[PDB]
């Protein structure tokens, strides 16, 4: 009952977040702030993949004859790299006194961003091998956690500055992603309830956060 229930809740919050996000795209910004729009567009692309998974889940859960948790990885392998890119864009936005856009960041940092996504890919591959019972759960937790910590280390040392704004965003995101590893430990029903709620936080709450930053910047523009 509780997987299907939390899946419907997720889908509700997905639809509300998509509405807020699309409105966000239209809100007037200074040219130096337009990377926030670039971020919201990528978050909406993520939402397309998330939605297809959640519709598949609610339809499929009617009649299930195996642990289908592994199917989430077909979503994660596409969405998590995009989410790491939008995190980099936000930190660069936050920490750049000068206007910066994704083209300039992508062109300059291509190699480093590739390695962030490669670390993240190895995390997911180890998780997938664990989820499909090809390696034991302890080895999965250790190997997956190693690559999670490597991904966030790479993010930290290149893209953070030493102030409260940076610590708050970085460490909240880190905790949320860590809890996907925590969830891995749990039996099928509890694990999938946890993933259903975590997706709301990692994906949808991030989009709403970006929307709020856009609202704040647009108001400054209106007032000036």
Residue numbers in the entry: 2 to 225
Relevant lines from the article:
Phylogenetic analysis shows that, within the rhodopsin superfamily, viral rhodopsins form a monophyletic family that consists of two distinct groups, VR1 and VR2. Here we present the results of a comprehensive structure-function study of two homologous proteins (61% sequence similarity) from the VR1 group, OLPVR1 (ADX06642.1), and VirChR1 (TARA-146-SRF-0.22-3-C376786_1). VirChR1s have proteorhodopsin-like architecture with short extracellular loops and share several structural features, such as membrane-associated ICL2 helix and an unconventional TM6-TM7 orientation.
Type A and type B crystals resulted in the obtaining of the OLPVR1 structures at the resolution of 1.4 and 1.6 Å, respectively. OLPVR1 molecules are nearly identical in both structures (root mean square deviation (RMSD) less than 0.2 Å), so hereafter, we refer to the structure from type A crystals as it has the highest resolution. The interfacial interaction in the putative dimer occurs mainly in the TM4 helix and involves several non-conservative residues, namely E108-E108’, Y111-Y111’, F122-F122’ with low surface interaction area (429 Å2). Strikingly different from other rhodopsins, the intracellular parts of TM6 and TM7 helices of OLPVR1 are significantly moved apart from each other far enough to form a pore. The pore is located at about 8 Å from the cytoplasmic side of the lipid membrane border and connects the inside of the protein with the groove on its surface, which leads further to the intracellular bulk. Surprisingly, in our structure, the groove and a part of the pore are occupied with a fragment of the lipid molecule, a host lipid of the crystallization matrix (MP and MO in case of 1.4 and 1.6 Å structures, respectively), which is likely to be a crystallization artifact and is discussed in more details in the Supplementary Notes.
